[PDB]
Amino acid sequence: DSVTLRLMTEHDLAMLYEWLNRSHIVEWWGGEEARPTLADVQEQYLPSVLAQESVTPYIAMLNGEPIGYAQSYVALGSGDGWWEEETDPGVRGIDQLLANASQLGKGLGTKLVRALVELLFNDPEVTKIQTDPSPSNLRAIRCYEKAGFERQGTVTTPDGPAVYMVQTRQAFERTRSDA
């Protein structure tokens, strides 16, 4: 059915910790910080701490069950080394994961990304959404393409080379109807 988003709260942190230590997630999420301890997740993902980095955390919901984690961020407002060429404060980036190995490759990630893109463009200040999957992460790249993102090129980030992908507000508008 329909994938929706709610703000993550401090009450979700234990659950997020469990998720971040599942093998299908560890593979693509964490980097240096792969397999975080409970304290790590509590210290790093508390919504008020993420707020200091211009990051907003969400829980993805399907049929009343939490099925994944997502975040949006102000690109111009990111940590040292991140998006240092950005000039547009309207640019938002996203990252996300599906909690359950059993639910991968069945279109749910595309639904989640579409829901996040729609949410973000419902802020009229937002001009463009970006994402930055690893070049190794072909599944994530395809999901993003299915959700309306276009590959731009390779960029150097603090987490290594990434495939920079974008979806502009104009593109989103044009694709809302076949009219």
Ligand X SMILES: CC(C)(COP(=O)(O)OP(=O)(O)OC[C@H]1O[C@@H](n2cnc3c(N)ncnc32)[C@H](O)[C@@H]1OP(=O)(O)O)[C@@H](O)C(=O)NCCC(=O)NCCS
- Residue 150 contacts residue 117 (beta carbons within 8 Å): no
Nearer to ligand RIO, 33 or 173 (CB): 33
Cα 12-116-170 angle, rounded to 5 deg = 160
36: contact with ligand RIO by CB under 6 A: no
Residue 174 interacts with, from Ca ion, ligand RIO, ligand X, none (CB under 5-8 Å by kind): Ca ion
* Pairing outcome for strands 55-62 and 3-7: antiparallel
Whole-Å CA distances, 52 to 68, 112, 138, 169: 22, 25, 31, 26
**Which DSSP string do the residues of 85-99 spell out, in sequence order?**
T---TTEEEEEEEES
Q: Is 73 in the site for ligand RIO (CB under 6 A)?
A: yes
According to CB under 6 A, which one of 93, 112, 119, 163 is a site residue for ligand RIO?
Answer: 93
Q: Are 131 and 161 in contact (CB under 8 A)?
A: no
Q: How far is the CB of 178 from Ca ion (least distance, A)?
A: 6
Comparison of 37 and 175: residue with beta carbon closer to ligand RIO: 37
Q: Which is nearer to ligand X, 79 or 107 (CB)?
A: 107
**Using the rule CB under 6 A, is 72 a contact of ligand X?**
no
Footprint on residues 100-129 left by ligand X (CB under 6 A)? 104-110
Question: CA angle, 174 as apex, 169 and 179 as ends, to 5°?
Answer: 155
- The size of the interface with Ca ion (CB under 5 A), counted in residues, is 2
Summarize as ranges the residues that interact with Ca ion (CB under 5 A): 174, 177
